[PDB]
């Protein structure tokens, strides 16, 4: 589980949404598995805008965070899941790293501030969905 807390605005992954953020609407795309949801409160992660392909992500089956190197946003064949059949994910970002289902949330960082967060993994690697290019998620 996890959650990026911007503005006025969460990210979380799509598949682990709440009836609440499904309620509290603002955006969401299944082919990403990412969801936005809008807040009362204000939130205190800063998005990154840059093209780092190195940073520090946090997995919770290890009370750890972990330094990696990622590749860029692409469309990457997943397996199937119990939240979704085998598919092309989009925007996804891998790196060698440790991931269990319960993962998904937990965030990747650079020098610049929040990337994305944990999606996908097994075997050894690690998926993270891409926030980078959602502009709008600093303003309005
Ligand atoms: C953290 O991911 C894992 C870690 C170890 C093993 C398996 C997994 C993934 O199958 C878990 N996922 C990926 C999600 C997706 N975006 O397709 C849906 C889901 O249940
Ligand atoms: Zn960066």
Redesign the pocket.
């Known amino acids: 589980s996890g959650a990026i807390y911007v503005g006025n605005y969460r990210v979380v992954?799509r598949?682990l949404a709440t009836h609440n953020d499904w309620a509290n609407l603002v955006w969401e795309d299944s082919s990403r598995?990412l969801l936005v949801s809008s807040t009362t409160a204000q939130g205190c992660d800063t998005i990154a805008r840059c093209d780092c392909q190195t940073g520090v992500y946090y997995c919770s089956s290890r009370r750890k965070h972990y330094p990696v190197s990622f590749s860029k946003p692409s469309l990457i064949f997943?397996?199937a899941?119990?939240?979704?059949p085998a598919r092309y994910?989009s925007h996804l970002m891998l790196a060698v790293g440790h991931?269990?289902?319960g993962?998904?949330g937990g965030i990747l960082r650079c020098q610049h501030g929040v990337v994305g967060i944990?999606?996908?993994?097994?075997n050894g690697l690690?998926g993270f969905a891409d926030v980078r290019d959602l502009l709008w998620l600093d303003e309005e």
Not at 81 to 84: F, N, P, R, T, V
Not at 118 to 122: A, D, L
């Open positions: 992954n598949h598995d997943v397996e899941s119990e939240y979704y994910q991931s269990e289902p993962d998904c944990v999606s996908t993994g097994g690690v």
